[PDB]
Design a binder for this molecule. Structure first.
Ligand code: E6D
Length: 212
């Protein structure tokens, strides 16, 4: 795999979103990976509905948080609608998939990246955007405005984001806190520290959709 990967330059990443006060990071994270893999397979970059996952993933807890892997299993089992069809409202409502007509996209499964393994994660990122978790509660992460982020942070992972690239010293992360946060909505987090948890626990729990 190459020294640099940046799915934004391959046109596989949609604009940065703001999840608002809703604890819907897990859905935003999942959708980034779906938007990425659909563009990789079909050549079309579309935006898909975080709201649908919020509303429809019964294993997750709506705005109280949830699981990227569940949301990704939902899209593999059922599918997902366009974001324009099922726009984000920032509150959990009832699952409206049936009222929104046929699904716009469907994946074929979910895979987990071997945890606590930087190389495994980089390999996955080189193939497609990956859903990753990290500890975002620390003020240093919250106040990040740019640069390669090294912490401080612990491994009390609490926030799902998407890894859309990497370089020799960092993993490139699309956050869901709007374009005002970090580097136009992105964070580069240090890699290669030999910490098997990853910086801020970044290697704890990583998943990606499979699309044939
Ligand atoms: C993420 C978010 O929108 O805000 C981050 C502060 C959610 O809070 C979320 O879904 N968190 C998620 C942790 C990873 C992403 C799976 C979660 O389920 N946290 C609660 C875990 C606890 C019950 C042990």
């Amino acid at each position: 795999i190459p020294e640099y990967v940046d799915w934004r330059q391959k046109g596989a990443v949609t604009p940065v979103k703001n999840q608002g006060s809703c604890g819907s990071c897990w859905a935003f994270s999942a959708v980034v990976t779906i938007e990425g893999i659909i563009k990789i397979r079909t050549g079309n970059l579309n935006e898909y509905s975080e709201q649908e996952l919020l509303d429809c993933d019964r294993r997750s807890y709506g705005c109280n948080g949830g699981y990227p892997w569940s949301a990704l299993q939902l899209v593999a089992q059922y599918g997902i609608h366009y974001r324009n069809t099922y726009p984000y409202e920032g509150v959990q409502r009832y699952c409206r998939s049936r009222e929104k007509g046929p699904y716009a996209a469907k994946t074929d499964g979910v895979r987990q990246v071997q945890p606590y393994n930087e190389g495994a994660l980089l390999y996955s990122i080189a193939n497609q955007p990956v859903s990753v978790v990290l500890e975002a509660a620390g003020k240093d992460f919250q106040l990040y405005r740019g640069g390669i982020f090294v912490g401080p942070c612990g491994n009390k992972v609490d926030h799902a984001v998407a890894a859309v690239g990497y370089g020799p010293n960092y993993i490139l992360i699309k956050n869901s806190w709007g374009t005002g946060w970090g580097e136009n909505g992105y964070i580069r987090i240090k890699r290669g520290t030999g910490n098997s948890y990853g910086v801020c626990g970044l290697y704890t729990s990583s998943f990606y959709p499979v699309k044939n």
